[PDB]
Amino acid sequence: AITSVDSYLLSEIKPRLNTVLENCYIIDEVLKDFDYQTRESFKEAFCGKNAQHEVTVGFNFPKFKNNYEAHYLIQLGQGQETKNSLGSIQSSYFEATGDTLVESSTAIREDDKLVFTVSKPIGELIKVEDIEFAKYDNLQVEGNKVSFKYQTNEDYENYNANIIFTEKKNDSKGLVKGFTVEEQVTVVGLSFNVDVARCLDAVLKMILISMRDSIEEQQTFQLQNLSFGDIAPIIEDGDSMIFGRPTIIKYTSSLDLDYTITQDINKLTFKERKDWK
Amino acid sequence: AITSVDSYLLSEIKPRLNTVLENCYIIDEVLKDFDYQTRESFKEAFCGKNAQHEVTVGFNFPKFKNNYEAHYLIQLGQGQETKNSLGSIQSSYFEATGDTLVESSTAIREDDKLVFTVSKPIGELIKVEDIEFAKYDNLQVEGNKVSFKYQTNEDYENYNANIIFTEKKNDSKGLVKGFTVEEQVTVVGLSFNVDVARCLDAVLKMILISMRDSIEEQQTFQLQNLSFGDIAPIIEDGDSMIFGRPTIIKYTSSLDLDYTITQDINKLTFKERKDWK
Amino acid sequence: AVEPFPRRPITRPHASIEVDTSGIGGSAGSSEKVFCLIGQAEGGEPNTVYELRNYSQAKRLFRSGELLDAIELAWGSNPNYTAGRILAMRIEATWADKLDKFAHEGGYYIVPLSSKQSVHAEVASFVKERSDAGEPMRAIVGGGFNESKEQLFGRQASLSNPRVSLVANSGTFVMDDGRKNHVPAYMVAVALGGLASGLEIGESITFKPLRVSSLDQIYESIDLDELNENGIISIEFVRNRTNTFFRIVDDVTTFNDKSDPVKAEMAVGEANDFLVSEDQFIGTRTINTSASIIKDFIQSYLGRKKRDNFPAEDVQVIVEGNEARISMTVYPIRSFKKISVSLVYKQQTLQA
Amino acid sequence: RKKRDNFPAEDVQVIVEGNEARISMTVYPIRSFKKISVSLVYKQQTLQA
């Protein structure tokens, strides 16, 4: 589809940043290389549930005064289309199929079948966690239900699995048209304290490494690549300098549209028409 | 792990700079190429235990007035990720294993074994200095103790050795994920005296050569590379010019995380379920 | 176990021999399907289970009674098969306390020599109590001298159990004394139990003959189908030939279900009661795994083995809680009940 | 090279100390048997003719 790396990053960094900063030993492991006093000061200031200081995230032109003790600025950069397919045909499909999902689900007993139930109608199922079925298991999917033969499998009547699938829009024929784009977003950890800046750098690098295994960039925002500027004053004429070290995050993804085709041929009918010449 | 070349350099230069400057004949050897008067003046000013002038090190935005007779400024530069592994899998391990260490240790007699004792629990041992053991020596490591058969070896009951090893965090399965980064730090020897600047240049080049054999960059901050700017005025509108010659130090290292996996398969159990078709 | 020689340990200088006998042990095969009877007799000591090995011994212990006629039929229906052991007990009302005595006598089929439905229910309960234990059993029962189809259906429904079969027909057997002995249908059940005991493990009594002189009732094809579908065994008088004979239509069971052969058909139930069922590599040798690579590994292994000596569609893998269960499908030997022939008439150009 | 013309790496120990290197080989002397342990396995074999 059409996608926006800035919205992806903003949506993804915030929970990850929260979950790291609520978890002291992670920071203690991230900041193991830094000086003891730097580490302890940052941990006591920003880290753990008692921490009163907090780190904030937002876009680059707010009208209000931001946090400047510790803030992450996300800033949509340049981008360029890099590789084209013949005819722009990126793919083609017999069913309009949306995002991929992962859900936790459990087996439940219908008197003929175990069923795993999914929040949405399933367009295709990719995995049931640590199950490989045989034909005897009579694996079948229908709507929002994944169904699985009970008769041998009562020992798994409440087995807990993660379902990897993708939603269905509708059963229709179509083509997916567009090209790959190589695109950048700059991020900078603003702080009026240089050592805070350097910690926010380390924390953001850790977060961005961890994001490489997330399904979002794994499917779509592939080939994450990181570059870093010097640490420098962003603003140098207040009562104190505001410092930051920019990092640039580059991605590859496909911009494309679902081009449906309503034409199809249902039947071939053969005639012989005779020419007397 | 996550690492910071600026903290490494600051932590490493200071002791090395002290130990050179406390040792006159080293400077006399370093400055052998310079003019006699330059050499003698610098030696009398800054060098040997009687010296009253001193050379200082710090980061680039202090709020106080630095030393300007002789100072080393350390300044975190640009960097870029350069090489990736497939899947980002940099390595994988069956035991979470920390820094490498070197310690001095001595044999001590238990009534069955000589033992070398180490400050920390040992995750792996790499060397015992100038010992190659046979199977007959029954070399075994356990916790913080390296143990070594006594029965033939009473002639070495107090042998003095250097132990090269690495600490253990815990016995757990996991993977190490990330990429190599190519990264720069600029250093400049500030002085209001040009000849002092040129000596601080020579001394820093010597220190940086000597650091190439240190275990820190040998393991992790590999491929040290040096570039140098012109000698120029840094500040030109005081009562005197402050001069410096910048050098840029470039390194290669891995930024990576310990991704542990709790999943493992302990047992395989085989069933035959019979199909009457 | 491995035997030490000497048995006593020794510490002074000596030799000792350890003998592995385990490469020679045998007799691990099955029991035979010993047959069991309970009923009236003279002479024998009541409520004592006797092993019998030939009819002379039977007439020596038991006399002058229907149990000895039963033993006769039990060896007379199968003259072209092994005349195996029989277990029999004179019973002089509850029958469970007597049936308990068979509990540790190793016999697989039982028939009570009675048509009373209480008896049949007791026997079914006993067969259940044994077969849910480590020692499987089955029973066969029959009606009186002539019962209607609706009576037989009512009886089967009341006695509907996956280890009991009802036989409908009754008739006349020529005994070895020459007597034309008219008998109730439960003696025909004794005859079928004898045949089933004589047949191999997981052979089936369908389309086997019955050496009977006449039947009290002859059922036409629709009645044979009715009884078969209701899980009642019936005997066909084969009339399509000058060599007429009597044929056991099927080995159906009073529990009838299309969804499970093992409970519907006696022979496959017996096979399941007698069938026999038949390498590890541990995750420390690898950094991480999944059911997909477990499946592909075990497929590569069994591919190598079957090349030296299995379909990927027929192995299932589940991993749970550090444990992986690998489940193969396997195919047991059944017996044909249907043959479908498609006959196509073509025509051909000859030329000369 | 010598044993090719005429030793296991697991059976030589080296210690270097104070400009001196001691190389220590293991060697195996001739003892005399005090124990004999016989494991006797009965197999069986199919003959055919």
Automatic annotation (TrEMBL), chains A, B:
Which Pfam family is an annotated match for this chain, by its short name?
Answer: SP10_terminator
Output the superkingdom of the source species: Viruses
Q: What is this protein called?
A: Baseplate hub assembly protein
The species this protein belongs to is: Staphylococcus phage 812
UniProtKB/TrEMBL annotation, chain D:
Listed name of the protein: Major tail sheath protein
Native source organism of the sequence = Staphylococcus phage 812
Q: Which residues of the full protein are shown?
A: 535 to 587 of 587
